[PDB]
């Protein structure tokens, strides 16, 4: 369709599969092969993403150009990468992925919304669509076009260390919060076929759901552990989401580390080919986990060949590898060489992830757009993380006894109030983990109000504001206090290292609550991940409120506080009473919660 030097694949009025199957069969085995390899920033380099035709970049948790890097900064660097993939004999751009989970939070200065357990607790979808769609927006701004989300695991086991990247013990919430998804990429067309990949263009990004399948059942809740349920009670409880996110077009699937009922997911071919691709006619990419390959062996990487072929058989199609670029290409052009992995699954794999880019629109747009730089940490969407925050806190007490004057909404005005503890002027601590670093971080991290901060500017000016981190009974009793605010509960983590058996939080906070509350009357903000071992600090409470991790945007805490908004959400999770009930989840025969699932105390607006 027109000039002599007429190339199909690169003809933007041509249907998509058109365009895919005429430029992969022009491709070269180490051409095809290079778009199934993922590969870390901190690896890449023109020589690297030119000479192996790689298809994709990441960074990974802090994978970052420099602290405090300007959203112009990163697509500078993104630029720099796609230029080099560009000059390939092909020029198929590069996707960059990244894990922007709760806002864009790699990026300094990016809106950090809360985790997903408190976005759970608002039970408001449209609310998580405009996350996606804000967060698209400061995606963009860094010039990266895929992110790694949703989450859409069912924690079963708060001992988890990613129970906070779950919506809810209950599957249903999580569904409900597909809506994630066309925030993300944009609505799908009327007419639109579940399974296929959509992003509306330039201005939305790729998502991933993951991570496939029952990463949330793993036993004692040890991360990427074994998963040991009935296929009934798989289907029942951690397969629903997978198929609202076909309906809506998600474009891409990660796969779990975890196994189920023994068999390693990222070799699990029954699920990945036989349910995830066949039955549920998923025609984007699948991308294995960071390293997931190596983990299938024990000890992981002790096997690499067999890792490779395991997971290209089983039927992923992109690997995260995301270091050893050189090893993985050499080992998978062997085996094809060698008969054991047909051209056809290779095919395939190509197929998936060319549909998913042209599909995007990245062959029109490969390269960042600079004026979208300035939607990064935009105020719009600060407010949008201050709504969700606000819909996110759960009040699990507000008055010691029933005939106490309940101590919520508190007064602006007052002669002096306190507002004490760990986590009442710690933004890292109110982010949580994946916030800059990939285990967050304490203190200033970025741009945002902490919870002191949000007093300080809500209060009337006539109302003196002490801070005490951690002030003994004394200080307390003598200094004249309204009443006090104090916010204490978990250090940021991530992964692994949040796993928790106990699920008690630091000291010192109880202790700091009890010297507070023992004074003046106190409303406790407890900032957590999960329910946590909870009896103590109620019971020297006046007020306790489950704030989970709300982002960047404290004055959310404040607003239901002193009461410019009503408390409206709700437990998504079972608060047990101790964790030797582990696992107890909402529906199970011997139900003895603290707080059941659903339960949150309301007020009205002042
Ligand atoms: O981020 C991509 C997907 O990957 C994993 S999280 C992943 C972190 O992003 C990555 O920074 C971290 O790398 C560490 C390795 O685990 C360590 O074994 C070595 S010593 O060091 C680096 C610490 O720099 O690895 C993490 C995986 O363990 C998630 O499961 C996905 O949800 C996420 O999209
Ligand atoms: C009361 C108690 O023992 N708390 C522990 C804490 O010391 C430890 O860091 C964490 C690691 O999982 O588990 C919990
Ligand atoms: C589960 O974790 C245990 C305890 O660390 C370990 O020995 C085992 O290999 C893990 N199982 C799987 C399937 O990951
Ligand atoms: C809050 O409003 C509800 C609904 O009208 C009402 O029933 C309740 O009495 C109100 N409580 C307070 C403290 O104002």
Redesign the pocket.
């Known amino acids: 369709h027109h000039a002599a030097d007429y190339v199909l694949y690169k003809d933007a009025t041509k249907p998509v599969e058109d365009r895919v199957a005429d430029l992969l069969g022009r491709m070269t085995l180490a051409e095809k092969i290079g778009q199934m390899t993922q590969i870390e920033r901190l690896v890449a380099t023109p020589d690297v993403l030119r000479d192996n035709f790689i298809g994709s970049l990441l960074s990974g948790g802090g994978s970052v150009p420099r602290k405090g890097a300007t959203a112009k900064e990163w697509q500078d660097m993104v630029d720099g990468f796609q230029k080099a993939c560009m000059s390939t004999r092909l020029g198929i751009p590069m996707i960059y992925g990244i894990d922007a989970v709760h806002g864009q939070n790699n990026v300094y200065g990016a809106t950090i919304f809360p985790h997903n357990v408190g976005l759970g607790a608002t039970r408001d979808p449209y609310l998580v669509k405009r996350i996606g769609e804000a967060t698209a927006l400061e995606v963009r701004a860094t010039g990266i076009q895929y992110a790694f989300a949703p989450c859409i695991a069912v924690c079963r086991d708060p001992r988890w260390g990613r129970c906070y990247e779950s919506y809810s013990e209950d599957r249903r919430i999580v569904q409900s919060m597909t809506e994630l998804i066309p925030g993300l990429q944009g609505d799908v067309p009327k007419d639109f076929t579940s399974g296929m990949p959509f992003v509306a263009g330039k201005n939305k990004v790729a998502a991933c759901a993951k991570h496939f399948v029952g990463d949330g059942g793993?036993?004692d809740g040890?991360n990427?552990?074994?998963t040991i349920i009935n296929r009934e009670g798989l289907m029942n409880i951690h397969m629903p989401a997978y198929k609202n996110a076909m309906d809506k077009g998600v474009s891409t699937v990660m796969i779990s580390?975890?196994?189920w009922n023994?068999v390693?997911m990222h070799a699990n071919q029954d699920l990945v080919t036989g349910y995830l691709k066949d039955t549920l006619k998923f025609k984007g990419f699948v991308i294995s986990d960071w390293e997931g390959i190596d983990?299938i062996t024990?000890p992981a990487g002790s096997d690499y060949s067999y890792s490779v072929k395991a997971s290209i058989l089983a039927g992923l199609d992109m690997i995260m590898v995301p270091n050893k670029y050189q090893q993985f290409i050499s080992i998978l052009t062997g085996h094809v060489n060698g008969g054991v992995i047909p051209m056809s699954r290779i095919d395939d794999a190509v197929t998936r992830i060319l549909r998913v880019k042209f599909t995007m629109g990245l062959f029109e747009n490969p390269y960042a757009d600079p004026a979208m730089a300035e939607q990064l940490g935009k105020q719009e969407h600060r407010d949008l993380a201050r709504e969700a925050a606000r819909k996110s806190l759960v009040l699990l007490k507000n008055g010691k006894t029933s005939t106490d004057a309940p101590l919520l909404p508190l007064p602006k005005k007052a002669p002096k109030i306190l507002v004490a503890g760990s986590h009442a002027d710690n933004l890292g601590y109110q982010c949580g983990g994946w916030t800059i670093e990939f285990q967050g971080d304490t203190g200033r991290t970025t741009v945002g109000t902490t919870i002191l901060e949000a007093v300080k500017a809500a209060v009337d000016p006539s109302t003196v504001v002490v801070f005490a981190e951690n002030p003994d009974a004394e200080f307390v009793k003598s200094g004249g206090f309204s009443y006090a605010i104090v916010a204490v509960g978990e250090h940021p983590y991530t992964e692994t290292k949040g796993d928790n058996l106990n699920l008690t939080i630091p000291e010192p906070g109880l202790s700091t609550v009890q010297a507070v509350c023992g004074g003046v009357r106190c409303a406790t903000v407890l900032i957590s991940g999960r329910p946590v071992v909870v009896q103590p600090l109620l019971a020297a409470s006046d007020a306790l409120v489950a704030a989970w991790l709300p982002g960047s945007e404290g004055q959310g805490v404040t607003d239901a506080l002193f009461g410019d908004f009503g408390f409206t959400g709700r437990l998504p999770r079972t608060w047990f009473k101790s964790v030797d009930q582990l696992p107890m989840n909402v529906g199970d025969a011997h139900y003895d919660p603290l707080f059941r699932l659903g339960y949150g105390l309301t007020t009205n607006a002042t």
């Open positions: 793993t036993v040890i990427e552990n074994n580390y975890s196994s023994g390693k983990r024990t």
